[PDB]
């Protein structure tokens, strides 16, 4: 009944989220963020970063029905960016590019979300998230 209409609305967001995540992942610049960080080159990511994230993990989380709101999905694109700034020093040019792309990834994601997605449509998602986190 109601739970019906609900999942039709979620399925729709969940579809959009795949398309944003495909767009960010094709982008040349965001390539370093499309894999999980390796611990071969980086022998200390996990001692420095307590919550790793990447774009392919986001992909799967979409299919795992983890993102109830666009805001939830941005919570994880946001964690991509803060992870980079928290890990990489910004003196070396090499270090700096990554830093740049992380801010850019974040800004790109938000602008897309800000521009393609109907404000009325978020409100519906959030009203569904608060419902499912109850009864």
């Amino acid at each position: 009944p109601l739970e019906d209409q609900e999942e039709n609305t979620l399925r729709e967001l969940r579809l959009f989220l795949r398309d944003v995540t495909k767009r960010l992942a094709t982008d040349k610049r965001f390539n370093i963020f499309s894999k999980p960080v390796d611990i071969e080159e980086v022998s200390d990511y996990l001692e420095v970063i307590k919550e790793p994230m990447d774009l392919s993990t986001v992909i799967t989380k979409i299919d795992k029905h983890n993102y109830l709101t666009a805001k939830d999905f941005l919570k994880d694109i946001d964690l991509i960016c803060s992870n980079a700034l928290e890990y990489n020093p910004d003196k070396d040019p090499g270090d700096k590019i990554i830093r740049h792309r992380a801010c850019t990834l974040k800004d790109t994601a938000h602008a897309i979300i800000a521009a393609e997605l109907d404000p009325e449509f978020n409100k519906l998602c959030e009203e569904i998230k608060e419902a499912r986190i109850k009864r």
């Binding site: 980086v42 022998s43 200390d44 990511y45 420095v48 970063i49 890990y87 990489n88 020093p89 070396d92």
Partner: peptide
Amino acid sequence: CGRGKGG
């Protein structure tokens, strides 16, 4: 800060 990616 971490050691860096490239070294």
